[PDB]
Design a protein around this ligand. Sequence first.
Ligand SMILES: CC(C)=CCN1Cc2c(Cl)ccc3[nH]c(=S)n(c23)C[C@@H]1C
Lengths: 558, 427
Amino acid sequence: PISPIETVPVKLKPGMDGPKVKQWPLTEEKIKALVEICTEMEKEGKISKIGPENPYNTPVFAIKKKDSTKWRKLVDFRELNKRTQDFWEVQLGIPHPAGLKKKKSVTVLDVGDAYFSVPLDEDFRKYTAFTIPSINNETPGIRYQYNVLPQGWKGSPAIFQSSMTKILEPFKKQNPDIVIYQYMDDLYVGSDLEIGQHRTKIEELRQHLLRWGLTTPDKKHQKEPPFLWMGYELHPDKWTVQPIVLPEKDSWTVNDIQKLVGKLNWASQIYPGIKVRQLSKLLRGTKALTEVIPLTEEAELELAENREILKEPVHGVYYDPSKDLIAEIQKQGQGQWTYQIYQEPFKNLKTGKYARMRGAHTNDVKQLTEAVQKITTESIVIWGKTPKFKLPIQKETWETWWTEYWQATWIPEWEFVNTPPLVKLWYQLEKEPIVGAETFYVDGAANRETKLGKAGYVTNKGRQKVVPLTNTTNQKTELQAIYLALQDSGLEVNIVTDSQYALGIIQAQPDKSESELVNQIIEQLIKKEKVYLAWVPAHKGIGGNEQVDKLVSAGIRK
Amino acid sequence: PISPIETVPVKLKPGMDGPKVKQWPLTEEKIKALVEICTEMEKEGKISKIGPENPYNTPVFAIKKKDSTKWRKLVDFRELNKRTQDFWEVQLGIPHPAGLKKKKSVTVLDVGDAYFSVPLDEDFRKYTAFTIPSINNETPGIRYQYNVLPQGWKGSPAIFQSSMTKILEPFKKQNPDIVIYQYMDDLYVGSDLEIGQHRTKIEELRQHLLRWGLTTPDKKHQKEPPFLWMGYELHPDKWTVQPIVLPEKDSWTVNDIQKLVGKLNWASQIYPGIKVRQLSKLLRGTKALTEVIPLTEEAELELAENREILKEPVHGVYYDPSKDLIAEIQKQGQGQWTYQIYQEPFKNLKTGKYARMRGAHTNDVKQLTEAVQKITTESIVIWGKTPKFKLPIQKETWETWWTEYWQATWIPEWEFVNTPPLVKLWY
Ligand SMILES: CC(C)=CCN1Cc2c(Cl)ccc3[nH]c(=S)n(c23)C[C@@H]1C
């Protein structure tokens, strides 16, 4: 049949016109099938042959495939698709399993050839014209236009999503507690009804649609209890991804690695622990996807590791709006963090992980926060709530972090809790010049072209020092000049730099960088009692500058 | 019901299509508040349900107005606004009253409700399309369209210009001094009245308004004592760049002299006239930070000398109405916040500090959020235009809680920084 649904008005793009894409006279052979398929199709009421007053025309294609015993039609309105308007973006967003709720029974019902059972706007029909001709020399140009939603035109899915949505309305008005999601051309009906008592309604539904011509070929709602949707694998009380294998072998190519990392991330949603650091870092090259990516030990070490976790299957439960969402976070290692959101004591709902790829050298506390965020966002998008956090960091450490930041932040209710990596400010600079300690006027620079530098300094006690440097730019030497002053310093020390950069970094109260100099600068500070970095505009003619600067003439002069 | 007005024909500025701004997922709390509000709107015919033949969108958020009362929807009309109203301001351009900022007080009446009467051109309704979200994309979203004059749109007060005037005429003729400016849907009304007088003169205007057109305002202050706001009873007769004092260190110290010399160095960018050379000398040793060095007789001359050149300002006062103003905030301390409004760096038209020390409301996001608005009003009152913001907060973080502490009708344009403030000090 067809559906008696209110047609939806469509119009070609402003200043556009129906396509005149003529076609390549296909083999007389399948030229027959185009007919016999079309006749029935026309007879079903889907097409109505009209060849005179409708100059538009699209190319008919045809062929068979995917374990079939018959011919299939092909037609792609791509040109028409180009001249058509933009419809509502059907589903610019799929749901996330961790948000669904548990139902007793569910069932999927294939929505036949859904697009056909629906009628296209009485006018656009013209713009859907095709030509099937008869032999190499004689073809009166038999032309047909559509009446139902074309099999591969731009409006179909949106229109269709809508139409069905309408069709389900009264029924679900009469039957309110049976959840329905749709999808593509698949209808997922679910609820809290006993298996039989459930198949009850599914029938009431199944015929309702039969009323609107939507032949649902499902016999008694024939559907596989383990649904295969968007990678996930669902059930009425649980959900999780399942076909994930890390291909083991030598001849590890770029693509295989990229693939490998995607694969893991995905697993990570539910799989508590997956790391991806080293393997992720490696792909950091440009498109040479075809070449070989020599995975070192550090990478191979993690792979085989996730491989261990990914081996033993984990499952997630569903949301119960009756319970408080909870999010607990831990710094698994280095820049890698992980988190989990649970409702009750031990059934995982959702798992994830934040990674410090962000800037360059970042504080950890900062990091915690940046993570508390990604979580916060994710929740909104799913449970519509904000989970109370289980954060590994004392309240006094954090309360002194945000109060000092130049940026703003917001701390949703979180309770402090004890666990390993503990979040705290490693070192911490002073606020005013320390009296006593040896004011150290640090400095140094390098010549970019010649890449030679010199860090060094001049305490306030006649004490100077310097070091020749090969392969160092003004920014490295600068911190390195801070490095010196920190070796040669004592417990309480006052440094003074020309650098804006080093002034900056040292202040970010960072840690564990991929910059030894820094890692070391940090380490000293950590091992120290009272630093107090300071800043005087370089070259401004401060004697403190003038001098440590004059030491540089030892490299050359200008 | 059945008896309406004519339709001022609006149209999208040529070479422009309608908006497709994506809908920010909202908490459920608000989703519900939106289906409520929205539905009466469907029942009173103000907004109508739509189909997929229409593919546009312009964001909505629920917000709780006037000191925690019930929800009010808000459409983030920025993009559309921009698209239609820009060239529409060249046409139905409402004008900006200079004298305003000079008035002792400016009170602000939300005339939003009104616009809900003049209908909207059948063809333009296409763009007012807002989409209210459904948690976790479980539902296709309740898509609406707008038949009347949406509130956020800026085309609306230009349209409702005609009607709104005459409503005011008899008031203005009895109250000529009272200046009345209209921005977006807000009635900025000011006078040089003794507070009480102004208070009354306003409610006089409150009442008048109701008579003349059931244009309804909010009963801001009843006879009951309340710790609630004192009304946006602004007072632009108090504004200035007074606090940027160079320290008065009698115990000048090597550190000090540096810090000072430092300040004077970027400062020299907003006052090309000052010279610190003579001061960088008293500092030429390689001594301990903590030691005194005030000597140079020639120098105490320059400290003092530059010290006051601050007060007396620069040329930076060329309100180019073509260039758009940039607002900028700096987090300063336990309540202190600061901004600067400018068109070309150091050519800042005005600057100021906001204050509300973390006590009964310590959320930075809050304090910032507020300030962004208290920053705005001004700009409106003065230039009659919102400054583009430079918010010192994380995108994702702000994109989440601005819509909460927010209690204003419009929504300024903004951008977030991730560049430390050298500009951090006391100013
Ligand atoms: C994510 C998809 C296709 C959801 C459709 N879906 C079916 C479903 C499944 Cl498959 C498992 C648990 C479920 N919990 C809820 S609610 N649903 C549900 C109802 C919607 C109707």
